[PDB]
Amino acid sequence: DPKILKLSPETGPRQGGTRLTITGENLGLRFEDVRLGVHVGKVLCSPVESEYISAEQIVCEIGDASTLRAHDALVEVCVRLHYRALSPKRFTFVTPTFYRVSPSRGPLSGGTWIGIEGSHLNAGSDVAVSIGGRPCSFSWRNSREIRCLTPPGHTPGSAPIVININRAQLSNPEVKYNYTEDPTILRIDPEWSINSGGTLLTVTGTNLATVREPRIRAKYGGIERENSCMVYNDTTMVCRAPSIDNPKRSPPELGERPDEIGFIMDNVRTLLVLNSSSFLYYPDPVLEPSPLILKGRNLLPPAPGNSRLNYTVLIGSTPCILTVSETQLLCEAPTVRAGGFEFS
Ligand SMILES: *[C@@H]1O[C@H](CO)[C@@H](O)[C@H](O)[C@H]1NC(C)=O
Ligand SMILES: *[C@@H]1O[C@H](CO)[C@@H](O)[C@H](O)[C@H]1NC(C)=O
Ligand SMILES: *[C@@H]1O[C@H](CO)[C@@H](O)[C@H](O)[C@H]1NC(C)=O
């Protein structure tokens, strides 16, 4: 008459402690009917009365299986002793391990998304990752990886990784996490972009390779906008300008500094806002509909330096070699792009 429908989870550490959840039918009436009749093979599973749902759910903590001479076992539930139910599938006792952390280094401020690779890392009912004794904020996990977020470090250098899965304490001295000095930002070249953004900016600083996915951010017109970067080496990365296009306002022809300009690099929050930055945003080009002469304004920057918009006229999906004046775009071939700007 009693029947088990599902077990969750299906694997657990051999040391025990797993909170097994047994869902079924006719699972007794009161907690006394099943308080002593739940076993995982030879191992006792102690039910928790607070999470016992009458005739439907039995939550029990699995005991120690360190001396059990078996790898998996069926779950037996005895109601009161004749009428008992056997689990449809088997519960597996495993020994979780890990062999790699990626990335193995990151800023001292923390905020680095790390994935610890190993075996049986999805076993049990809870998990807790620690680096140097501080909690790595758990995000998710499967059988081969645990994704968590590093905490701020005490001092730069290596730090041990310890994982807790119920009563199992996983360690590996060959797998450490190296806290590095926080990256710094020195200059942005060129120090300007257009309203639609999307232009390539060369950012130079220190320890840039210690952050896997740095981003660039700008606050303008009451709106925050972001864009992606790619690190080339510890002192040089390339970003795309955030687009500040919004219906509240647009930059003037002479340019205006954004309310904020900065970078998102893990939890190095001092880089979020560059206060003394003179970065300017300029208007988008204003074009209008056998050489072709596309006329318009805001084509060249009002500040003549070493840089100018890298235009591309994709007529026929083929770039044309072009000469650019203040009011001239010239194609010489037998749809207009500039960073994130596009117009025909
Ligand atoms: C941590 O990384 C730095 C380079 O950023 C390196 O010089 C140092 O040796 C590393 N520490 C360990 C323990 O690997
Ligand atoms: C990084 O690459 C840039 C581009 O050539 C170069 O100018 C710079 O010196 C490099 N920095 C290091 C630390 O290698
Ligand atoms: C300008 O755009 C063209 C077309 O994509 C590209 O080949 C070229 O490298 C770009 N130049 C610069 C300086 O970004």
Residue numbers in the entry: 861 to 940, 944 to 1152, 1165 to 1209, 1218 to 1227
The authors write:
Class A plexins (PlxnAs) act as semaphorin receptors and control diverse aspects of nervous system development and plasticity, ranging from axon guidance and neuron migration to synaptic organization. This work reveals a 2-fold role of the PlxnA ectodomains: imposing a pre-signaling autoinhibitory separation for the cytoplasmic domains via intermolecular head-to-stalk interactions and supporting dimerization-based PlxnA activation upon ligand binding.
The membrane proximal domain IPT6 (domain 10) is positioned perpendicular to the ring formed by domains 1 to 9, and the IPT6 C terminus points away from the plane of the ring. The same relative domain orientation recurs in the structure of PlxnA17-10. Possibly this distinctive orientation is stabilized by a loop (1,175–1,184) extending from IPT6 that provides hydrophobic interactions with three residues in domain IPT5, Trp1055, Ile1057, and Tyr1145, which are conserved across the A class Plxns. In the full-length plexin, the linker between IPT6 and the transmembrane helix is predicted to be short (6 residues for PlxnA1), and thus, for this conformation, the plexin extracellular segment is most likely positioned close to the membrane with its ring parallel to the cell surface. The interface between PSI3 and IPT3 (domains 6 and 7) differs markedly from those of PSI1-IPT1 and PSI2-IPT2, imposing a more acute angle on the relative arrangement of these two domains, and thus reducing the ring circumference.
